[PDB]
């Protein structure tokens with residue numbers, strides 16, 4: 071009565087001994103690509119009806135950091151997809167209040183979302199999948215699920231996923247990640263196609279005018295780009311059920327297999343004074359507003375200090391940002407000194423004998439590289455990797471102040487720290 | 499009667515399946531670190547009495563490329579040492595001609611050597627070991643060899659390595675890499691310490707005023723920094739015997755072990771009209787003169803097009819540089835075009851449906867990454883990796899000209915090309 075998970079076979083794959091917190095196993099398990107060194111990755115994107123806020127920044131900066139670690143640090147080949155939910159009841163309601171068209175509202179706030187991501191040095195995905203551009207593919211996706219007998223059509227023209235039929239199959243389990251969270255045959259059945267009121271935006275289908283259900287959007291778009299097995303699927307933890315568990319059920323029903331996703335990664339949400347930052351509560355800080363108070367580096371350090379899959383509390387009025395500003399200042403001043411010493415070093419007059427002080431710094435340098443390696447393997451532990459960099463910088467600053475300078479050693483140290491800061495998404 | 503070679507054990511090491519051309523085995527063998535992902539690497543540097551020329555550029559740019567592949571691409575931890583031979587008969591003779599002082603002449607041309615390396619975007623090594631700063635350590639190194647009974651002192655105050663005594667030992671073999679190339683007990687004995695000629699610069703020693711022999715300099719300095727096992731030792735192929743084979747004998751004698759170096763890499767020399775570029779022949783082109791006609795990128799492309807361990811012929815008067823200029827121009831124009839397409843892309847008015855043209859380009863993109871990976875694993879095959887990049891750029895240009903653009907895909911491809919060009923040492 072418990073869902074089973076199959077670890078990908080290691081033969082022929084890139085093996086880093088990376089471990090990740092997999093919501094499918096509720097445990098840290100070794101990460102193994104489905105093919106070679108390739109990672110097919112789908113991450114749920116925003117619903118675009120208003121300005122993005124610091125909670126959205128936490129989600130996509132956290133996954134940006136993970137992506138940079140996977141690509142820049144481990145040298146996996148990441149094929150990444152992020153969707154835009156530009157059809158949704160919230161977009162419809164806001165469009166009528168503002169008296170603008172639904173498409174015009176969604177495109178404006180999708181544009182501002184990407185501008186905010188770029189301002190935070192978040193990389194764009196390989197593919198951007200908008201629901202409004204994939205409705206035809208969604209209809210075909212639903213037709214296959216019906217043909218596989220896992221969805222039924224109501225009299226009013228809606229289509230519902232048939233939970234009971236899906237569970238019956240030995241190969242299928244419903245709600246793999248949150249089993250206990252569980253016209254219609256059963257109440258738990260969810261809509262793949264919702265019959266549209268004539269005043270709502272709608273699309274033609276074999277079953278009548280309607281709109282896609284929320285969950286089928288992501289199953290369709292991820293399946294069309296990345297296929298029948300995703301290495302990684304990600305989102306905020308609140309999407310784990312019903313949204314993501316329903317995605318798994320739909321995609322298994324479409325492909326008639328047992329494991330559409332190998333690793334499901336859920337980031338923790340940003341809370342402010344204990345409650346999730348959300349437009350509903352009126353506790354939100356837009357990313358643009360945040361960037362008039364703090365820099366991209368400082369905001370990224372905020373998220374580097376909080377493990378990606380843990381809940382974090384943000385204390386406003388600068389309280390949480392005090393530490394980020396101090397860390398940012400120490401990185402700026404370290405780079406200032408080391409860059410100048412490299413530039414002004416004179417090979418004509420120096421002595422380059424490899425001293426004991428040189429050897430000690432070099433030993434700490436190589437040791438720090440191994441510590442950071444273990445931290446990244448440990449489920450992307452950026453808080454301890456950042457601390458390791460701080461400790462190394464403290465010793466480099468002492469060395470630059472007092473000791474005779476090995477120019478090449480300082481240059482190599484500078485390149486390594488730049489490599490880690492590129493992996494973090496910091497720009498100095 | 500054949501030297502034996504021991505491959506390092508794979509347990510606990512970083513294993514990339516990289517193969518390198520090892521002069522100790524005269525074959526391509528898998529590269530396995532002695533410890534973890536670490537690479538201790540010593541490369542023979544210049545003798546500094548005159549301007550550096552294009553032959554030197556080939557050696558140190560080739561090793562710079564290999565180092566960048568090892569560090570930036572494969573993520574090995576490389577600890578690299580390059581020496582400066584600033585005591586040598588050539589420096590002594592040139593100093594009497596120039597009358598500016600022996601130390602001062604050597605320091606002048608060492609300074610210009612490093613300036614030329616920087617002009618070619620060649621990274622400084624972790625440690626720079628000048629012979630003049632290590633004479634005391636050289637004397638102690640020779641003392642240990644004598645104490646181990648592998649060197650004797652002549653009446654005139656020179657010290658010679660005792661080949662016959664060294665060979666007798668079961669654990670030792672003399673001239674491991676070129677076995678057939680082979681006061682003194684035997685003619686083949688070589689000097690560790692040279693009694694000082696009158697009027698020449700000299701240093702104190704237990705055996706009298708003198709200068710180090712050439713080979714003992716590199717054994718001493720490499721051993722002092724990197725210890726009793728080097729992962730890599732490198733130099734131009736003409737150094738393989740007697741210089742490098744003698745280095746192995748001296749270092750084995752000092753540590754009384756059987757394998758001082760695991761992988762000995764020898765770069766091919768640059769020839770011009772069939773003869774090695776050399777100050778003696780008067781066929782040389784200085785790096786400075788080369789840089790008044792061509793750029794760092796163009797010169798680096800010249801060397802990327804020639805496998806590092808093969809001989810290359812250089813046709814002067816621009817003939818060889820015609821192809822390098824064409825390639826460099828196409829890279830500059832590619833970046834101009836793609837940056838313009840990215841900057842002019844408007845997320846507000848676009849359609850981002852993942853088209854057949856998008857999928858075709860992405861498939862070629864991932865395929866190109868695997869081709870380049872296999873080229874680097876195949877003994878640092880930069881000529882075919884560069885060709886793979888050129889082919890990819892040809893298809894990206896076609897895609898940018900006609901197809902509707904997936905902005906995220908173009909950015910990701912640009913970042914990969916930036917990564918490969920950082921690995922090559924090209925700057926655009």
Ligand code: NA
Nearest residue numbers: 237239240242
């Ligand atoms: Na079942």
Ligand code: NA
Nearest residue numbers: 308309311312
């Ligand atoms: Na939930």
Ligand code: NA
Nearest residue numbers: 665667668670
């Ligand atoms: Na022997």
Ligand code: NA
Nearest residue numbers: 736737739740
């Ligand atoms: Na030779």
Ligand SMILES: [Zn+2]
Nearest residue numbers: 114115288313
């Ligand atoms: Zn989703």
Ligand SMILES: [Zn+2]
Nearest residue numbers: 542543716741
């Ligand atoms: Zn040498």
